[PDB]
Design a protein around this ligand. Structure first.
Ligand SMILES: [Zn+2]
Length: 88
């Protein structure tokens, strides 16, 4: 689970992958954990609760280990044609 550093409202990790699955380079980033964690810290995200932008470099050190879990737990409930992402 992700939290906003401006308002402090709950965010889902399944919504971030589903909204960012519109890029063709994403199929190459999903195979390497070192490129996915470095891209989240360098890129900024928008909050639908407050409206202000938050960076992946200002997030906690325990949530960064949760990103390794989506990359490692591949094949099962992830479809490219139907655009469905599952997190365990
Ligand atoms: Zn917010």
């Amino acid at each position: 689970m992700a939290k906003c550093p401006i308002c402090g409202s709950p965010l889902k990790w399944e919504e971030l992958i589903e909204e960012m699955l519109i890029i063709e380079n994403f199929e190459e980033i999903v195979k390497d954990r070192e490129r996915f964690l470095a891209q989240v810290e360098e890129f900024v995200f928008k909050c639908p609760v407050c409206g202000e932008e938050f960076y992946g470099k200002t997030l906690p050190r325990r949530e960064a280990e949760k990103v390794f879990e989506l990359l490692n737990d591949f094949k099962g409930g992830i479809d490219w044609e139907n655009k469905r992402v599952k997190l365990k």
